[PDB]
Amino acid sequence: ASAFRPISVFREANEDESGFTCCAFSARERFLMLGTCTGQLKLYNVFSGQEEASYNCHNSAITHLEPSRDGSLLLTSATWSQPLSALWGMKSVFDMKHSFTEDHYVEFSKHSQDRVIGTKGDIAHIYDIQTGNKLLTLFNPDLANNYKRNCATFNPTDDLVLNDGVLWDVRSAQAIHKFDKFNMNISGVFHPNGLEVIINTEIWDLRTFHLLHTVPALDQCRVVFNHTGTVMYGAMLQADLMEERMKSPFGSSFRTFNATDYKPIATIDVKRNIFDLCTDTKDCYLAVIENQGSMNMDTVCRLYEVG
């Protein structure tokens, strides 16, 4: 994953200032879901570039998507507004199923997608998709690390949760390790292989809690894997000053890492500010949202083929 061939681009249709703000390959083949800077969820043919559907989902910019593996459900988070996070049905007709009115970030469980885990500040809320019941509430003030950009996440087998840098056993809802706070914002993800935990630049061992790796270039990055968790992608965030002018979450470049030994592969600078990036289900494509600038945002989805 060092070569990246442009395959197609498209901008938001009918909009002088294109407002795509996040993307995710849908379970359907040739199609990408993009949330937009104005609450909307669009459906696009990643190759033709044609817009296929449009759904007003929130009344503020969409920050995060996650389509379900089976094609039937979608999660969305927003920036401000009620609900902060919503779960949508998608089988032949787009309707809301649930809504998590205070979670500013939501994500499906990993093993069987039988639970949504949502984040509110330093708190994690697991819900149940059929009913919407809050099964758990994971937080511990004696252990909280107050990560500015915390996102509670499930592990591959749903056995564990990580939230504010604390490791939780879901069966007993008992925190089983705090990882020392070494940065102000990044809370960590579980490695897809399930053997290690990546918290900002620290790669910890999940079984011994040993430091296995220092990776300075993952400082402040969000991280995304290829489907097979053999390539790692890191885009670095940017920054709190001043009022607002619709500031892109990431800078202008991203990096690829061997997912196994964290040795670097390539640095990819697209000379444009990145809002989001995602990888497909078949390991062929990386799709990136890239601001072109205006008098204040004008983004285009670029679909790259990985090499």
Added chain:
Amino acid sequence: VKPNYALKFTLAGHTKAVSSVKFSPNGEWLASSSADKLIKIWGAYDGKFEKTISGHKLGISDVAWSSDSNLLVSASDDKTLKIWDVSSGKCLKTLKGHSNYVFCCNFNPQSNLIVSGSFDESVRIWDVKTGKCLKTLPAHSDPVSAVHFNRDGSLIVSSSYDGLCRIWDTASGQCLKTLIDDDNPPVSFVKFSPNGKYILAATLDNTLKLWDYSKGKCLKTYTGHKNEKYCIFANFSVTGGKWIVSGSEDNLVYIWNLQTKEIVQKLQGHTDVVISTACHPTENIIASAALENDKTIKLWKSDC
């Protein structure tokens, strides 16, 4: 660069305590409201004694314009809001329906809807072109200290003495959110940040907090001033540097740095509690008004 607030013009001629000041959406005029039942206009750079408006029987706590700077809505202690033709001062309409004093009033960006908070312990959405009351929101268990509209107009932020800051869905009237500190001190002022993501809010334990109201967390807290008994109207400052400005109950007006909470500048001079301050949309200008022991306005200009 730290500010250089310089006292430019002082405005006298108010019979009693003056409670609220504002600059025009154009910034050529300064509108003030007093416990003397009067609304007055002054020269928004030079401070010139303009027209003076009248018709409210009791005191007036606060005064807001519309987008085109053509109508004020005064909120009076006679349970009344009135919309005024700024050009003539001929009261356009007298909004009616609150049960007790009306203390806070404002419009939405399309200069068509009125939002009022009151001691009747409610908030109200009015129609400016007709004056009818659209909505009665049992906003709080107590008198309602501020009401504000965001840069679009689909949210109402409200203050209350019950420590409850609150956010409202205008098009529906639903209570979108409900801020609470872990404690419950009263909140005496609230407004949106000019970028809409955030909320300034004053409380009466000498506190002034900036909030991100959808994540529900306090992102900064400025202090040092005196705010224990009175509802001082505080402001942002995004003309030069990004500041935070607010009057006080030791007859001063304190300014902190927006993003570092530090006591950047102080401005003394008044004789009583500084109850109101506004900042000119364009220029780096500070207005400030105090209660009956002063009964005057005062203007400060900064190079930044």
